[PDB]
């Protein structure tokens, strides 16, 4: 007879008592159990082929992805605690800054800057949502997938803040077209085509490894420095404390995504040849990221400086990741 264990059998002989995180997040995917036939059906189904090509056949290789650990060790239970805290904060700003008529004291020029540079971000934020939710359903291991899960929720969070604020701005300035014209700005404004080209193309990079890179290593730092960092500093200097603070709040999430992205790369570089794989995808996408920062920040005041600070900062992300 088998003796009952003091932990999950796959964690046994771990030397240290497994955390709640290890207990509820590890070795969960089962499709990786049979590379030749990942799902319990015909091996020729189009979805069998999809996972085989884009998951198992990725150039980014490792012998035990399930070994990956989220540096923050997030779990559903702790994600809601942390975020419900953060939301109390942002929702608090919303409620009280509204109370002292913060939106009524913004200047006309700045209101137009928001209609062009702020509100249409709801499209780019949802796009990142779609992008990070794809990494989730194609990643090779459950701990990697989970990071993508919570990051997708943060993405929906940013989208949400933006949706809310757009309604408030439309109520305060019904003549600007708030809520109504963001789609045309997103689709036709030259300041958005840099970013729109980037994500639309990155959204069809089906390889799990390239997806991680295209969205997390290249696109996100670009969007975060452009829309959160640069527009955030401008908002503050322009009298918009709400957006200056809101932007900063969302950057807390972004920093978290960079932490696990960076950890995954750390692990990836143990395997010989991966750095080159990662640098090749970065080199393929980085050019589009520059074109995104340029088009967006060039249209902002002190654009040339914003474009330089952003390019520099986003690259710094990958630099210290050892790339």
């Amino acid at each position: 007879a088998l003796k009952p264990l003091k932990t999950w059998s796959h964690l046994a002989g771990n030397r240290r008592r497994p955390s709640e995180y290890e207990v509820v997040s590890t070795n969960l995917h089962y499709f990786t159990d049979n590379p030749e036939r990942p799902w319990e059906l015909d091996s020729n189904l189009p979805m069998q082929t999809w996972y085989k090509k884009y998951c198992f056949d990725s150039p980014l290789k490792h012998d035990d992805w399930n070994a990956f650990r989220d540096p923050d060790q997030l779990v559903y239970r702790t994600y809601n605690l942390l975020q419900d805290g953060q939301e109390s904060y942002v929702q608090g700003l919303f409620d009280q800054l509204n109370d002292r008529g913060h939106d009524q004291m913004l200047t006309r020029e700045w209101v137009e800057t928001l209609a062009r540079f702020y509100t249409p971000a709801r499209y780019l934020f949802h796009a990142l949502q779609m992008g990070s939710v794809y990494i989730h359903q194609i990643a090779p291991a459950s701990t990697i997938t989970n990071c993508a899960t919570y990051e997708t929720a943060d993405h929906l969070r940013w989208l949400t803040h933006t949706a809310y604020r757009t309604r408030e701005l439309a109520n305060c300035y019904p003549d600007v077209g708030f809520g109504k014209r963001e789609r045309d700005v997103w689709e036709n404004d030259p300041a958005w085509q840099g970013f729109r080209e980037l994500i639309e193309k990155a959204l069809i990079a089906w390889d799990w490894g390239e997806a991680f890179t295209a969205i997390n290593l290249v696109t996100k730092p670009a969007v975060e420095e452009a829309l959160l960092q640069q527009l955030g500093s401008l908002a503050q200097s322009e009298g918009d404390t709400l957006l200056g603070l809101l932007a900063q709040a969302q950057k807390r999430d972004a920093e978290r995504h960079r932490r696990w992205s960076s950890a995954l790369v750390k692990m990836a570089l143990e395997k010989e040849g991966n750095r080159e794989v990662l640098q090749k995808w970065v080199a393929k996408w980085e050019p589009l990221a520059d074109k995104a920062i340029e088009a967006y920040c060039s249209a902002l005041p002190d654009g040339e400086n914003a474009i330089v600070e952003a390019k520099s900062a986003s690259r710094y992300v990958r630099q210290m990741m050892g790339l």
């Binding site: 007879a1 009952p4 509820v24 189904l45 419900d84 509204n98 989208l159 809310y164 639309e200």
Partner: protein
């Protein structure tokens, strides 16, 4: 001051745009999206009836876990799991092993809609969906985890789906077909509408009720909570079917629902049916598995199907007669083959239980009782070895479950065989064989346990071999839940 949800909600789901740097089909490949020629603009009519925003979510779900987890920490040192009826303990072990990781997998099924659904509203609701199943998967690992030092069997709450044990294969067979290998629009219907709205939302309600009656308030609390999340994402199938019917796709819709419901029924006939009619103590049985299905599942399906513009599946009549048999055989099989499962099957055929069975199912003793008579005699006559198998049962090639039906004085066991491309397939029902025929390409080269056996994939090719094959070893191999205690009432 804050705004009312109704004032800004639409803006959270106003996210569709016209791709320019890539084509719509590249962005939304049909194999993953399943738009079925319905335009982006038409899918935009999608409108979930139950709305919720991110801040509401994190706040609500934060308190749910606070409660569920507190309950557990409070009844922890009480070690109820030790005084619990063996029929109950087996119930949980079975539940956690067959569902824990499948719940987590559902997270990915949600993620499929979240990324490939052309309906914006569908995309966000699915993001909360993937968050709901993340919890269900994690919480249902943390809970049974508390008992790993009590039996190696609890370790199966995590290991089951990673093994080749027949019930595990049966599980993955269902789930993979319904939510892991289907396009987005397909998933919303087969999983969300048919399985969650049609079965689990109410099952978990009954499961929670039973947990309580057994004195297991930790599990009762677990299921209730999880249950309260179901409606939030199980609602995603409704609007999809509306869109498909509203256009020229009523037959395609109908066919997915037909497939999904039957495949669900089968899994339900082996995981729930046996449990409420045999594992639960006689004095805790509110109604039979049949009454449960007629009252909490069947009526609702017809209503759902009526208000939606769809019809009742072609097999509806058969499905209802089946409520008198299927689960009884599915139970006899599991018990008769106990060493092949990771929980201890409760025979549930005591004199009292047998008369209850006769009341709920007139003619039971005339048929099913027959087999149990022979089994009981052998246990009384010191011939237990005649109550455990020497061969493998015939597995249905669709539901990967034993082919069984009415025995005794009304013998009616049938095999809906089919020859496709030089191979002979076996089906436990007309519907099962039909699910294969409408889309043969999807199951063609798959092989059930018996097929693998007959192909030398299991070595040694004996019973001890098939046991190491399905990762079973003394310690987790199932036997009679009450240690044949019920046999004394016949001596």
């Amino acid at each position: 001051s804050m705004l009312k949800r109704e004032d800004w909600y639409d803006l959270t789901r106003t996210t569709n745009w016209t791709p320019k740097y890539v084509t719509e089909n590249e962005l939304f490949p049909e194999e993953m999206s399943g738009a079925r020629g319905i335009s982006m603009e038409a899918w935009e009519k999608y409108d979930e009836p139950y709305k919720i925003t991110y801040p509401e979510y994190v706040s609500i779900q934060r308190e749910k876990d606070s409660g569920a987890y507190s309950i557990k920490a409070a009844l922890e040192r009480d070690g109820f799991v030790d005084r619990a009826d063996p029929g109950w303990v087996s119930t949980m072990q079975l539940h956690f092993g067959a569902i824990a990781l499948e719940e987590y997998a559902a997270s990915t099924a949600e993620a499929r809609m979240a990324r490939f659904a052309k309906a914006p509203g569908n995309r966000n609701m699915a993001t909360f969906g993937m968050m709901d199943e993340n919890r269900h998967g994690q919480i249902q690992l943390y809970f049974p985890y508390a008992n790993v030092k009590r039996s190696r069997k609890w370790d199966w709450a995590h290991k089951a789906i990673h093994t080749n044990e027949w019930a595990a294969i049966a599980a993955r067979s269902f789930f993979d077909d319904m939510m892991m290998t289907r396009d987005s629009v397909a998933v919303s219907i087969m999983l969300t509408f048919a399985f969650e709205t049609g079965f689990t939302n109410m099952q978990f309600l009954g499961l929670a009720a039973d947990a309580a009656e057994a004195g297991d308030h930790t599990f009762a609390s677990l299921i209730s909570s999880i249950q309260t999340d179901e409606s939030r994402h199980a609602q995603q199938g409704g609007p999809s079917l509306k869109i498909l019917v509203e256009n020229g796709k009523k037959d395609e819709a109908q066919q997915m629902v037909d497939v999904a419901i039957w495949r669900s029924w089968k899994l339900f006939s082996v995981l729930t049916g046996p449990i409420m009619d045999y594992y639960t103590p006689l004095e805790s049985r509110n109604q039979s598995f049949k009454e449960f299905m007629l009252e909490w599942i069947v009526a609702q399906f017809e209503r759902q199907l009526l208000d939606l513009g769809l019809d009742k599946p072609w097999y509806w009549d058969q499905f209802m007669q089946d409520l008198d048999e299927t689960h009884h055989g599915m139970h006899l099989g599991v018990w008769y083959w106990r060493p092949t499962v990771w929980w201890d099957p409760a025979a549930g055929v005591s004199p009292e239980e047998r008369e209850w069975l006769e009341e709920k199912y007139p003619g039971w003793n005339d048929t099913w009782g027959q087999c149990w008579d022979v089994i009981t005699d052998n246990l009384v006559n010191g011939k237990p070895e005649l109550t455990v198998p020497e061969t493998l049962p015939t597995i249905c090639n669709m539901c990967n479950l034993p082919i069984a039906h009415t025995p005794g004085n009304k013998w009616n066991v049938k095999d809906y065989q089919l020859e496709y491309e030089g191979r002979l397939y076996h089906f436990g029902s007309e519907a099962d064989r039909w699910c294969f025929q409408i889309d043969p390409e999807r199951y063609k080269n798959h092989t059930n346990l018996v097929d693998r056996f007959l192909k030398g994939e299991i070595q040694p090719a004996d019973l001890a071999g098939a046991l190491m094959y399905m990762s079973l070893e003394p310690g987790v191999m199932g036997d009679d839940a009450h240690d044949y205690e019920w046999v004394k009432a016949y001596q």
